Symmetry: C3
Subunit: 254 residues, 3 copies
């Protein structure tokens, strides 16, 4: 384990901690190290579950790094987007039991990792909000992430949240079903362990087949047109009008 | 704007008011004027959102005009049904932000317009009920409208509501998620404006792409078999047994 | 009516009572008699609705009889599974109004019958739990049953419940929408009759077309690959590793 941008720690439970300050942005390095490390954990027969969390409280993950997609060549965008898809595909289809101990704000990209988990626990910190606010950035959530959201909080709620780019604070996220539980910040990790222990009481093979059964359609919808999705992101992101608002948004970030 | 059956009024917000008393029935004239007017509003770059409402409080819309489909020739039915599909397709796929200020009873057809909106606000008048009660009329909601309903209140609730032809009063409609908000009658229009203002804080292009993304599948399911849907309505509606109950239902309306 | 494993009793309402103690297991005999009897009721123009229930309070149905699928030849498994599909297809697609008066525990298979009904009423007995706990048995709910569950309590809830094999007691089942109503045990049957009476106020033809419309996609997904589903069950069930856990589970049942 590189243990550079993501620390992997540790019965049958491993913890992956985002270590990419200031805001655990999803850089290409990060996306790459995450998948590679996730794979080692999956082939490690002694690991049955994984808890995802930020090593630094405050921000779970700010999501994609806008810089990775500004003033770059098409080949890079293609490579980049493929890595984002990969991250989603590997998490969403993982045979491990995944639990998000959301100990910080988790907008857009950060929210996708949480959405791929089998259970989501959030810190009762009013400053922490989770949701897909792409629309506000002049961007739009990819169809597959959208389906993942729909499968989580319902089609109607997703329709409103995605268009308004809604970011839900703890109580609201719980009410809409975006998170499954809200506990005081200091209990988030221990609760993740409690819940994890329960999932471990489930025979691995049948749990995994059930999970696979629940998600194949959603994943397959992406896998069958992966190249087309990459081409579309490259086209859309390369547009001067969109490249532009990607600058005004970055500058306002100063 | 004809401003005959539908009044179009008026920053970036236009209001379309049903003006087809006694019950704002969805006559062919009405369906036709509505689409034509809606189109002018969509190509009017100064209009970003539209609030739908009855110019006369009490009845939002009674839905289709049963007379338009009794003792008519197949060619008429085909033409009629095509206009109903059109009304749904244009509203459901509109790039404008649509908000229903439901200031009256809104059964069947009236409910479809509300279901196509991006947000639904209803007057807290116990006499106002909204829902798809086709089954009671011996009729059945079209598959696409059914999918729209399913996407709104869930498959299970829709299954019950559509079979029982349930009409929900304010509190109930809110509880099932059919409407997003319930306010005192006199505040319905102002609230529609408040909410609308918020949606306007969302960059138009990304909001529109998101919306389009959420609804294409549903709409496309109709577009790919539009002619077949028209043929089916014509067959089903032309049946003597169904034409019959369409008389006993009309007579009881005296 | 054989009236051996299932008693058929009786305006326009018939009652089918599971009579296969000790636990109303879904034996092949039972599955066969149920379908045959259900068919007589459907072709009996004087019967419009059917209430399902256990003649013996305590256990609605324990679901499939594990013995029917241990140490058997492939031809039997194929025959068996075809009968399970049949039971689901006939109930799910029935033109009759089906109401489950759940007067006992209803795990796995028992839960499938309840899920196929148009309305579910449960006895307020804390000892009664309903849900699909296949995963715990080292088994997994078939895709079609999974879709039926998803259509009932939502995709997210189903994902959790199916993986954890959750069994919901009355209050919990009501909260998740698995059951539509919870009444004191002694009122279950009378309530089933009350509700049934209401569904009868709905014109049969339009109710049936609506229902058919709501469920064809789900059913058709199975019908188009029925043989493949049978082959898969036979393969999966025949595996020595799965045949094994099917013994350790049976032995622990002593
Ligand atoms: Zn590159
Ligand atoms: Zn800790
Ligand atoms: Zn610690
Ligand atoms: Zn005509
Ligand atoms: Zn007004
Ligand atoms: Zn006014
Ligand atoms: Zn046999
Ligand atoms: Zn009784
Ligand atoms: Zn009795």
């Amino acid at each position: 384990f590189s243990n550079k941008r993501v620390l992997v720690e540790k019965a049958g439970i491993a913890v992956m901690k985002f270590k990419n300050p200031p805001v655990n942005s999803l850089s290409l390095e990060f996306l790459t190290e995450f998948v590679i490390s996730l794979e080692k954990l999956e082939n490690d027969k002694s690991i049955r579950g994984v808890i995802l969390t930020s090593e630094r409280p405050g921000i779970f993950s700010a999501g994609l790094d806008l810089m990775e997609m500004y003033g770059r060549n098409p080949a890079h965008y293609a490579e980049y987007w493929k890595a984002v898809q990969e991250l989603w595909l590997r998490l969403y289809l993982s045979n491990l039991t995944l639990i998000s101990a959301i100990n910080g704000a988790s907008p857009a990209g950060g929210c996708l990792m949480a959405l791929t988990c089998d259970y989501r626990i959030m810190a009762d910190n009013s400053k922490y909000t989770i949701g897909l606010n792409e629309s506000l950035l002049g961007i739009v959530a990819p169809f597959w992430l959208k389906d993942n959201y729909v499968n989580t909080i319902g089609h109607r709620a997703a329709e409103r949240a995605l268009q308004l780019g809604t970011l839900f604070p703890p109580a609201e996220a719980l009410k809409v079903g975006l998170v499954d539980e809200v506990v005081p910040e200091d209990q988030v990790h221990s609760k993740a362990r409690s819940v994890m222990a329960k999932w471990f009481t489930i025979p691995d093979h049948s749990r995994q087949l059930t999970k696979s059964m629940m998600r194949k359609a959603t994943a397959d919808n992406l896998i069958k047109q992966r190249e087309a999705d990459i081409q579309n992101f490259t086209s859309f992101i390369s547009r001067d009008s969109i490249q532009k608002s990607l600058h005004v948004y970055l500058e306002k970030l100063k």
